[PDB]
C-alpha cells in the first residue's frame, strides 16, 4: 500500500529514535571534545531552515504544509543517527581505540550527511523538490557535499538499488556541472594549489579534495567517452587521443569549465580530434550518439555558455571559444599521450 521506496525507508528506521543511541552516545563520551551539542545544534538549525523553505510558496516551487515537513525531518534525523552510528563504529580510529574528537567536529560532514539523508526521504516520497533544492536551501557547496555520497552507500546497505542509482546520479550532476559554478570552492582549492590542475597519472595512478574530485571527474569522463567511442564505432587508438585533448582542456584551459558541462568539452574534443586525424564523425552523428546516455538532455548542446551574458549552441562554442583555445595542441597530431583508466 506504500511504494517499494517509502516501504524500505520505514523498515530502515524501525524502532530507532530521532536521537543518538546509547552506543553513538558512548563514542561521543569517549572523546575529549564530546561533540553531542554541536551536532544537536546543526540539526536544529538545518531543520528550522528546512521547514522555513519547505513551507514558503516561491513562484518556482509551490509551498506545502508544516505537518509533512516535520515528518520528512524526523525521518532524515532517525537515518542520520543510524548512519552516524554505523560510520563512527566502522571508523578504523574507533577500531584502534583512538580519540575521534577531530572526525566528529567537522561540521561540513554533519551538514552534508543530514542533507544527503534529507534528499533520501524527498527522493523516496517522489518529492516535487528535485536535487539540488536541498543543498541550495541549506547553503551547501556541492564540491564538499559529493564526498558524503560514497560514505552513505557503504554505511547503509538496506538502501534499494533505486536509492543508490539516485545517489550516484546526483554525485554525477555535481562532477559534470554544479561544482564548476563561478561560486564553487573548487576555484579556491585550485588557487591554494598555485592553480595546478591534477593530471590522470597523479590521481588515477597526490591526495586531498582536489585529487579526489578530479579522480571522480576523470572517471566519469572516461566512462562517457568509452560509451560514445563504442556507439560511434571509432578506434581505441584515436579514443586515446580524444582523452588527451579532454585532459588538455581540463588542465591547460580549466576556466573553459566555469559555469559549464563536462560533456560540452568532451564532445568538442571528439570532433576536433576525429578531424585532425583522417577519421571524421560530425557534431550531429555525435549529438545523436551522445543523445542516448542517461545524463544527456538538449540544453547541454543546445544552450551552451559563450559570454560572462550570451548563451547558444554547442557548434557556436566550438567555433567562437574552443577552436582558438585548443587548435595549437590538437594540430600537433596530423606528441605524447595520457593514460585511459580501467
Amino acid at each position: 500500500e506504500f511504494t517499494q521506496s517509502v516501504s524500505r525507508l520505514q523498515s530502515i528506521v524501525a524502532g530507532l529514535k530521532n536521537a543518538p543511541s546509547d552506543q553513538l552516545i558512548n563514542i561521543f563520551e569517549s572523546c575529549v571534545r564530546n561533540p553531542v551539542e554541536n551536532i544537536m545544534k546543526i540539526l536544529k538549525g538545518i531543520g528550522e531552515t528546512f521547514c522555513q523553505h519547505y513551507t514558503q510558496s516561491t513562484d518556482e516551487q509551490p509551498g506545502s504544509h508544516i505537518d509533512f515537513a516535520v515528518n520528512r525531518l524526523k525521518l532524515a534525523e532517525i537515518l542520520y543517527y543510524k548512519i552516524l552510528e554505523t560510520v563512527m563504529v566502522q571508523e578504523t580510529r574507533r577500531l584502534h581505540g583512538m580519540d575521534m574528537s577531530v572526525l566528529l567536529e567537522q561540521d561540513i560532514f554533519h551538514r552534508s550527511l543530514m542533507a544527503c539523508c534529507l534528499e533520501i526521504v524527498l527522493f523516496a516520497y517522489s518529492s516535487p523538490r528535485t536535487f539540488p533544492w536541498i543543498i541550495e536551501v541549506l547553503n551547501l557547496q556541492p564540491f564538499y557535499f559529493y564526498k558524503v555520497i560514497e560514505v552513505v552507500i557503504r554505511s547503509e546497505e538496506g538502501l534499494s538499488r533505486d536509492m543508490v542509482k539516485h545517489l550516484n546520479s546526483i554525485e554525477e550532476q555535481i562532477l559534470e556541472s554544479l561544482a564548476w559554478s563561478h561560486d564553487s570552492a573548487l576555484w579556491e582549492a585550485l588557487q591554494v594549489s598555485a592553480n595546478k590542475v591534477p593530471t590522470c597519472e597523479e590521481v588515477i595512478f597526490r591526495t586531498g579534495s582536489l585529487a579526489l574530485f578530479y579522480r571522480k571527474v576523470y572517471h566519469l569522463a572516461s566512462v562517457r567517452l568509452r560509451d560514445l567511442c563504442l556507439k560511434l564505432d571509432v578506434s581505441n587508438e584515436l579514443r586515446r587521443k580524444i582523452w588527451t585533448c579532454f585532459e588538455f582542456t581540463l588542465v591547460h584551459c580549466p576556466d573553459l569549465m566555469k559555469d559549464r558541462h563536462l560533456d560540452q568539452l568532451l564532445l568538442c574534443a571528439f570532433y576536433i580530434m576525429a578531424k585532425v586525424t583522417k577519421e571524421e564523425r560530425t557534431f550531429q552523428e555525435i549529438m545523436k550518439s551522445y543523445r542516448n546516455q542517461p545524463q544527456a538532455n538538449s540544453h547541454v548542446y543546445r544552450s551552451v555558455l559563450l559570454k560572462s551574458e550570451e548563451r547558444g549552441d554547442l557548434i557556436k562554442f566550438y567555433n567562437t571559444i574552443y577552436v582558438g583555445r585548443v587548435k595549437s595542441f590538437a594540430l600537433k597530431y596530423d606528441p605524447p599521450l595520457s593514460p585511459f583508466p580501467h
Binding site: 576536433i272 585532425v276 560530425t282 557534431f283 548542446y301 554547442l314 557548434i315 566550438y318 567555433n319 594540430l331
Partner: peptide
C-alpha cells in the same frame, strides 16, 4: 581550418 560549417537544427 578545423571549424564546423554544420548548422544544428533538430
Amino acid at each position: 581550418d578545423i571549424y564546423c560549417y554544420e548548422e544544428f537544427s533538430d
